[PDB]
Structures are given as structure tokens and as C-alpha cells.
Amino acid sequence: SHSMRYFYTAMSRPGRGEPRFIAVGYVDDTQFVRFDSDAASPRMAPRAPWIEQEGPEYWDGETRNMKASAQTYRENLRNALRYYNQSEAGSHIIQVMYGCDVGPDGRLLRGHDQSAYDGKDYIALNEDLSSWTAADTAAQITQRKWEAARVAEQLRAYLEGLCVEWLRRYLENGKETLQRADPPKTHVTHHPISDHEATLRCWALGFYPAEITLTWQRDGEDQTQDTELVETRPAGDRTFQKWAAVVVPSGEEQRYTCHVQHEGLPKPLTLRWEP
């Protein structure tokens, strides 16, 4: 299965200019496009190698669409300010995330379209792709405007049509990286803390996609509650890193095993500290 998602952030800044609009697009865990309205000349830009092969009608069409969106979102910020009777002095933010998910055969599994105002849910398109869920009285004004204006019928046509068609295309074009799971490079490090304890750290480095399970076991017993598990972090090279550490009593190190499950691994790995 695969997904395509766009993320929009629209932020006002009174006394500091017009609102800022930033958009990013992803296929699975790979950022592939970006747009920022603060840029001297704002443009939808590539962020992954396999999208660089899209022609200029693509980039221009996307830039036009992003600017019209930035404009709709600045108006939306003013509308929200009136709906909420807020002061013109405060900075406010609208966020949006939408896209489609496809199955292994490429058929639309699910469409998404959610918006937030000041970090809170505002309105979302339902799974039926024909109705909206509004979070408050202000969002109901929007919902009624969207029902009158047949917005859901338009979004459905986008999600079932263009969204799916384009994702299928991106997956074929990026097949070598998007459809080839990179397994983690693993190792266990040992760090005495004192003469009686030591940290065992299990590393999973350079993996793709982000989804991974890194766990420690002591004599085949899961240590989730005692494991310091850092949030999956970008390595900066489109791959991910994660580590799970356990503080262990000196002399117990050989009883600890780290277990790594990832798409790119045929069979799960089992690692120990190798002195």
C-alpha cells in the first residue's frame, strides 16, 4: 500500500507583514515537494530525486495552485478572525493535510482532507467523500458554504481521479527507492556508567521506510517500559535512525538481545553486545 499527502501551514503575523503559507508533499515517508510564500518568488519545488523528472506544466501548474491556495488561506485567516471575533493583534495559523491511499493494485483505498485553526481540528472531509465534519460554530459557517458550493463533490473527483492517478505514477517513477525497503544497519554499544551499571544501546541506522520496531529483550523478555526509545529521527539522507537503550547491571550484558523488525529485513535480526 502507498500514500500521497500534502501539508499546508498558513500563519498570520500582525505588525510583521502578510500571512506566511508553507506546503509540503509526501509519497509514503519521502518528502517530494515544498512551497513557501515567504520566498522572494514562491515555487512548488522538488525534494526527492524521482520527482525531478516531472515536466514544467507540472511545476507551473503546482505553483499556480499553491499561490491561489496561499491567497484563499490569507482570506480564510481573515474569515476565521471574524468568525472567532479575534483581535487583529494576534498571530494565527491554519493547517491542512489531504491526499489518497492506494492498495497494491493501485485502486483508491481512502481519501483525506483535514484542516486545523491554531493547532486544533477545524473541518475534515468524511471517508464517504460527500460530507464534512466541522469542529465548532465557526467551522459550521465553512461547512454550509462548502455544502452550498458542492466542495465535497469536487474533492471526491480529485481524490478518486488525479490523486490516485498521480500517486500510481510517482510509485512507478520512484520504484527503486519507494518500492525497495532499505534495511537498518544495526549494532549494540556498551557504556559503563559506574563500576556496577552499563548502558546497552541498540542502533538501527539508515533504514527506509520510517516504520521500525526496535526492542530489547532480557533472556527473551520484552523491556519496552525500561527502554529509552528515541523518536524515529531523520538521518538527513531520507533514511531514518532509531535507538533503544537499556541501563543494565554489570554482568548481565550477555543476556540482553536487541530485536529489529523492518520491511527491508527478510527475517528479524537478533543482536547482542559483541565484546
Binding site: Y58, G61, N65, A68, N79, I94, W146, V151, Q154, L155
Partner: peptide, 9 residues
Amino acid sequence: LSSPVTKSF
């Protein structure tokens, strides 16, 4: 490809 649908609040 991004949505062309106008979402006026």
C-alpha cells in the same frame, strides 16, 4: 499532484 479545489472558509 495537489488539489485544485477551492476551500474558502
